[PDB]
Design an enzyme around this catalytic site. Structure first.
Site, PDB file in Angstrom:
ATOM      1  CE  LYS A  10      24.501  17.149 -35.069  1.00 35.28           C
ATOM      2  NZ  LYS A  10      23.520  17.973 -35.625  1.00 35.28           N
ATOM      3  CB  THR A  57      25.884  20.897 -34.978  1.00 33.25           C
ATOM      4  OG1 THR A  57      24.550  20.864 -35.676  1.00 33.25           O
ATOM      5  CG2 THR A  57      25.789  22.546 -34.275  1.00 33.25           C
ATOM      6  NE  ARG A 176      24.863   6.913   8.620  1.00 27.51           N
ATOM      7  CZ  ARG A 176      24.820   8.040   8.292  1.00 27.51           C
ATOM      8  NH1 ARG A 176      23.913   9.008   8.478  1.00 27.51           N
ATOM      9  NH2 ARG A 176      25.916   8.489   7.749  1.00 27.51           N
ATOM     10  CD  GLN A 228      28.711  15.641   5.799  1.00 28.83           C
ATOM     11  OE1 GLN A 228      28.760  14.463   6.143  1.00 28.83           O
ATOM     12  NE2 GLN A 228      27.991  16.472   6.039  1.00 28.83           N
ATOM     13  CG  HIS A 256      18.274   8.934   3.720  1.00 31.34           C
ATOM     14  ND1 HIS A 256      19.322   9.287   4.415  1.00 31.34           N
ATOM     15  CD2 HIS A 256      17.862  10.173   3.208  1.00 31.34           C
ATOM     16  CE1 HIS A 256      19.698  10.611   4.379  1.00 31.34           C
ATOM     17  NE2 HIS A 256      18.799  11.111   3.576  1.00 31.34           N
TER      18      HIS A 256
HETATM   19  O1  AZA Z   1      26.287  11.243   6.986  1.00 27.12           O
HETATM   20  C1  AZA Z   1      25.752  12.011   7.194  1.00 27.12           C
HETATM   21  N1  AZA Z   1      26.142  13.494   6.920  1.00 27.12           N
HETATM   22  C2  AZA Z   1      25.038  14.474   7.155  1.00 27.12           C
HETATM   23  O2  AZA Z   1      25.298  15.663   7.035  1.00 27.12           O
HETATM   24  C3  AZA Z   1      23.781  14.181   7.677  1.00 27.12           C
HETATM   25  N2  AZA Z   1      22.581  14.573   7.949  1.00 27.12           N
HETATM   26  N3  AZA Z   1      21.706  13.525   8.103  1.00 27.12           N
HETATM   27  N4  AZA Z   1      22.186  12.370   7.969  1.00 27.12           N
HETATM   28  C4  AZA Z   1      23.635  12.625   7.814  1.00 27.12           C
HETATM   29  N5  AZA Z   1      24.421  11.902   7.539  1.00 27.12           N
END
Ligand code: AZA
Ligand code: PDC
Ligand code: PDC
Ligand code: PDC
Ligand code: PDC
Ligand code: PDC
Ligand code: PDC
Ligand code: LU
Ligand code: LU
Length: 295
Positions: A10, A57, A176, A228, A256
């Site tokens: 469920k 269920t 950015r 990352q 973005h």
């Molecule tokens: O932080 C980012 N990691 C990415 O892999 C990436 N690719 N374009 N902009 C990005 N900005």
């Protein structure tokens, strides 16, 4: 042909529970959405229309409510473990129970700067989740997570030094906007059973709080080289703070916000250091994932 895998149960079982303190009048509420899927010696329901092996269920649903009535529903790691353990103990032919719990926020209202005894607000759609897999002879595996934590920083994010070739149009940037919806999961060491889960109960709420705190502080304070790089710093810290966690996984969309060139209109300057107005993009989005463990 043959059944190679099967599970059934469920989904989308909404549950609310109230605790009423008799001495103080203070009430506390919990609300969650539960899914329970069972595995076991159930292949004949598929191959031979043998329904005798099916715990309906609808009965699984009843069991969720009965379990909630008879046990604490918090922390969700415990509730899920109790629930999963019930099924593998009650039914000889059920050998695994997979329990997913999504906890919804009901935060106590502050009225005139005083916490109200029985009124609550949904402060945001951030969730606390658990996935509990209770497998006969293999203990209890728990993944805890937070999801839907939406954040933005308006500066102190960069992205440069990436690979440039004939498929590349993206301009390097030293300033950015960075915005994401954080999904963070921590996988606990295998527990031998319900007693072991119960023995660690204080760690569950504390680790969730820590994971949230680390995520926000790191996001806010890192001068980020990339999504990352920032996510790795988060995971590294969480692993350092709780040795019973085996791995930490982040999944982060890069939502973005595009600069808008307005120089075509009366020479208006809105790019680079003059950028004030941006166009949030609904799609596409970057998607960045990582699982970090101990070396
Ligand atoms: O932080 C980012 N990691 C990415 O892999 C990436 N690719 N374009 N902009 C990005 N900005
Ligand atoms: O990062 C780059 O832009 C780059 C790297 C190697 C060669 C070239 C080039 O030939 O333009 N450009
Ligand atoms: O093919 C390339 O090397 C490349 C692609 C995009 C930009 C640049 C550059 O800015 O040099 N170079
Ligand atoms: O140094 C470079 O990478 C470079 C120089 C001139 C043109 C380009 C290009 O076309 O990408 N790239
Ligand atoms: O799960 C835990 O962290 C726990 C359990 C019992 C006692 C203690 C303690 O005294 O720290 N901590
Ligand atoms: O085994 C434990 O539970 C333990 C050991 C050291 C510190 C703590 C703690 O501060 O909770 N808990
Ligand atoms: O309440 C506690 O005792 C507690 C809370 C968080 C972590 C730990 C621990 O790792 O021992 N213990
Ligand atoms: Lu080039
Ligand atoms: Lu402790």
């Amino acid at each position: 042909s043959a059944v190679k895998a099967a599970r059934y149960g469920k989904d989308n079982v909404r549950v609310y529970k109230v605790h009423k303190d008799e001495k103080t009048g203070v009430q506390t509420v919990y609300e969650m959405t539960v899914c329970v899927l069972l595995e076991g010696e159930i292949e004949t329901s598929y191959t031979k229309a043998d329904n005798s092996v099916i715990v309906a269920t609808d009965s699984i649903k009843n069991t969720i409510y009965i379990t909630a009535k008879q046990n604490p529903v918090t922390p969700p790691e415990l509730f899920g473990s109790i629930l999963g353990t019930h099924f593998i103990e009650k039914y000889n032919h059920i050998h695994a129970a997979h329990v997913n719990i999504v906890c919804h926020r009901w935060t106590r209202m502050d009225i005139d700067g005083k916490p109200h005894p029985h009124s609550f607000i949904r402060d945001s759609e951030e969730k606390r989740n658990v996935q509990v897999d209770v497998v006969e002879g293999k203990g209890i595996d728990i993944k805890s997570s937070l999801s839907g934590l939406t954040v933005l920083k308006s500066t102190n994010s960069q992205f440069w030094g990436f690979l440039r070739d004939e498929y590349t149009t993206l301009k390097e940037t030293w300033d950015r906007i960075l915005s994401t919806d954080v999904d963070a999961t921590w996988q606990w060491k295998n527990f031998s059973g319900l007693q072991e889960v119960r023995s660690h109960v204080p760690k569950f709420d504390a680790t969730w709080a820590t994971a949230r705190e680390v995520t926000l502080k790191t996001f806010a304070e890192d001068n980020s080289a990339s999504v990352q790089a920032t996510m790795y710093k988060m995971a590294e810290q969480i692993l350092a703070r709780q040795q019973l966690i085996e791995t930490v996984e982040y999944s982060l969309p890069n939502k973005h916000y595009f600069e808008i060139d307005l120089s075509w209109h009366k020479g208006l300057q809105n790019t680079g250091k003059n950028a004030e107005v941006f166009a949030p993009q609904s799609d596409p989005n970057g998607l960045i994932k990582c699982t970090v463990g101990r070396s």
